[PDB]
């Protein structure tokens, strides 16, 4: 750590506090995360230093000293959450929303091709720069209910299979989360703001319809599925994300399919007609 000087507190991350810091030597400005060490952790983390992509926050170095773990990441000046809030009254322009979704799908396609899942995608761990790029952060660190600061972990972006107690979820969980983020960027309001696991599940059911064996084979046998779940009817996406166009609604619907196996893959989503006219606009930061 002596090689680093803490500039400011970036925020209380899920696995520890994060500080903007400078390499007392290289002058490099980075994001320093102190992880709240098992050999299994070290090996997995070392594997992440290899997962390099333009849309994945670069893990610069892993420091294992004094039996403590520090992760040094590339530094970006803001997360998507702050940007969405700052664009609340005007709304993020569609071309930029399209650009961000496109880039994130590229990042996911990359990770997923390497069999790596994010598992906890949310606006707070999506970082943007002044150039128009957006990157996935804290990728692979998943493999708690509260943070080290007791802060509640958001359930708003959790896939239904996870909520239903699935133990071996797939890359499909990341597509679901991104779909929820996509919808939020368009409407300027969280799609499923649950404040408990059951409230989260029921919010999803109230919008997409209570899942059954027809739309999701095997759902009634899932760990936490209850035959007593209320049966709500499905609503039109025309009502869910106006004024998103049909290409956009088509894509969002495929990203929010109940059956993880039916849910569109990142790579297939990249070929969706919605991205026919994709561009890379510069954000107003
Ligand atoms: C909650 C949290 C804490 C740390 C990070 N990590 C780690 C990784 N991987 C960063 C951040 C960063 N830059 C930056 C990120 C946020 C930020 O402000 C966050 C505020 O908390 C905004 N909120 C209102 C959402 C300022 C600079 N550059 C590289 N890595 C992330 Br992702 C989320």
From Swiss-Prot:
Residues 4-275 form the Protein kinase domain. SUPFAM superfamilies: Protein kinase-like (PK-like) (SSF56112). The modification N6-acetyllysine is found at residue 6. The record marks 9, 81-82, 155 as: CDK7 binding. The keyword Cell cycle applies. Binds 2 Mg(2+) ions. Its EC number is 2.7.11.22. Keywords: Acetylation, ATP-binding, Cell cycle, Cell division, Cytoplasm, Cytoskeleton, DNA damage, DNA repair, Endosome, Kinase, Magnesium, Meiosis, Metal-binding, Mitosis, Nucleotide-binding, Nucleus, Phosphoprotein, S-nitrosylation, Serine/threonine-protein kinase, Transferase. The modification Phosphothreonine is found at residues 14, 149. Phosphorylated at Thr-149 by CDK7 in a CAK complex. Phosphorylation at Thr-149 promotes kinase activity, whereas phosphorylation at Tyr-15 by WEE1 reduces slightly kinase activity. Phosphorylated on Thr-14 and Tyr-15 during S and G2 phases before being dephosphorylated by CDC25A. Phosphorylation at Thr-14 or Tyr-15 inactivates the enzyme, while phosphorylation at Thr-149 activates it. CDD domains: STKc_CDK2_3. Its cofactor is Mg(2+). Changing residue 9 to F: Reduced phosphorylation by CAK. Serine/threonine-protein kinase involved in the control of the cell cycle; essential for meiosis, but dispensable for mitosis. Phosphorylates CABLES1, CTNNB1, CDK2AP2, ERCC6, NBN, USP37, p53/TP53, NPM1, CDK7, RB1, BRCA2, MYC, NPAT, EZH2. Triggers duplication of centrosomes and DNA. Found in a complex with CABLES1, CCNA1 and CCNE1. Interacts with CABLES1. Interacts with UHRF2. Part of a complex consisting of UHRF2, CDK2 and CCNE1. Interacts with the Speedy/Ringo proteins SPDYA and SPDYC. Interaction with SPDYA promotes kinase activation via a conformation change that alleviates obstruction of the substrate-binding cleft by the T-loop. Found in a complex with both SPDYA and CDKN1B/KIP1. Binds to RB1 and CDK7. This is Cyclin-dependent kinase 2. It comes from Homo sapiens (Human).
